[PDB]
Design a protein around this ligand. Structure first.
Ligand SMILES: NC(=O)c1cccc(C#C[C@@H](CC[C@H](N)C(=O)O)C[C@H]2O[C@@H](n3cnc4c(N)ncnc43)[C@H](O)[C@@H]2O)c1
Length: 271
């Protein structure tokens, strides 16, 4: 069953991309080449990455978002969202639903030659942090900080299954909840499930697209929940969090890659 661009893959029946689609049709190499590999500078996807890195830098380095344990939810094949965080947290746990994404992640932790090249992104973060260290030293600190790579499902009461983890100080999730939640009630339940991994008063850091109904990996279209800022704030507060700050930007992806109307960033604390 293929729709050929009429509807997102795995959504003809339910209206939203199913979880099985990510296990079979989400190619981590093609995703990294499309969104985090840049042919010409100053591209729309490069501007979004630069803004994400600057916010993560401000959150973990300039602000007081630190702790012992950081859990990354829906990381996919990416590690850019952890570069500043490894300076504030001793241990980092990386999670995603796609087994292929976990394989691409584990290839980078072992520094395999066929792994993705994150050095231009690492150098940018080093410049943001005052050039105290260089690229290779920055990457090694993150690899030593990542202590576990697990499979996760935000729709389950126990997102990590039966794996025992201590209550985390922060939960980070970038560009995942819009793709993992078919509706707002599931979005609210997903936020609650992540709360079961947090200490009372732990931080919730979320960055995602705004009013996005789909995103593209080459020719493959994947569904996205078109949430507005107003809907996001209500869902976060309803799930039992207090928002410390909430930022929205107008910069969007290219329509040939996503139909978003900007992105948002928020830091919340568990009530
Ligand atoms: N919304 C948009 O328009 C849009 C625009 C551009 C890019 C994206 C995206 C994406 C990726 C993550 C990117 C990564 N985090 C990063 O930072 O780039 C979605 C990830 O979410 C995971 N997943 C899907 N279902 C899940 C579930 N039930 N439980 C946990 N994980 C789930 C998938 O495996 C996938 O890896 C979305």
């Amino acid at each position: 069953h293929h729709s050929s661009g009429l509807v997102p893959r795995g959504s003809m029946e339910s209206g939203f991309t199913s979880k099985d689609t990510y296990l079979s049709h989400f190619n981590p190499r093609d995703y990294l080449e499309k969104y985090y590999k840049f042919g010409s500078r100053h591209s729309a996807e490069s501007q979004i990455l630069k803004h994400l890195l600057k916010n993560l830098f401000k959150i973990f380095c300039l602000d007081g978002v630190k702790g012992d344990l950081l859990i990354d939810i829906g990381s996919g094949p990416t590690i850019y969202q952890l570069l500043s965080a490894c300076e504030s947290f001793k241990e980092i746990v990386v999670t995603d639903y796609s087994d292929q994404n976990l394989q691409e992640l584990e290839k980078w932790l072992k520094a395999a030659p066929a792994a993705f090249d994150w050095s231009p992104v690492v150098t940018y973060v080093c410049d943001l942090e005052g050039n105290r260290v260089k690229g290779p030293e920055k990457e090694e600190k993150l690899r030593q900080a990542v202590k576990q790579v697990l499979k996760c499902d935000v729709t389950q009461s126990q997102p990590l299954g039966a794996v025992p983890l201590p209550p985390a100080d922060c939960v980070l999730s970038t560009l995942c909840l819009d793709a993992a939640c078919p509706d707002l009630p599931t979005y609210c339940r997903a936020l609650r499930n992540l709360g079961s991994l947090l200490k009372p008063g732990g931080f919730l850091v979320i960055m995602d697209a705004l009013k996005s109904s789909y995103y593209m990996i080459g020719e493959q279209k994947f569904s996205s929940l078109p949430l507005g800022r107003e809907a996001v704030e209500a869902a976060v507060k309803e799930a039992g969090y207090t928002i410390e700050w909430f930022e929205v930007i107008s910069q969007s992806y290219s329509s040939t890659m996503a139909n978003n109307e900007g992105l948002f960033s928020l830091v919340a604390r568990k009530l």
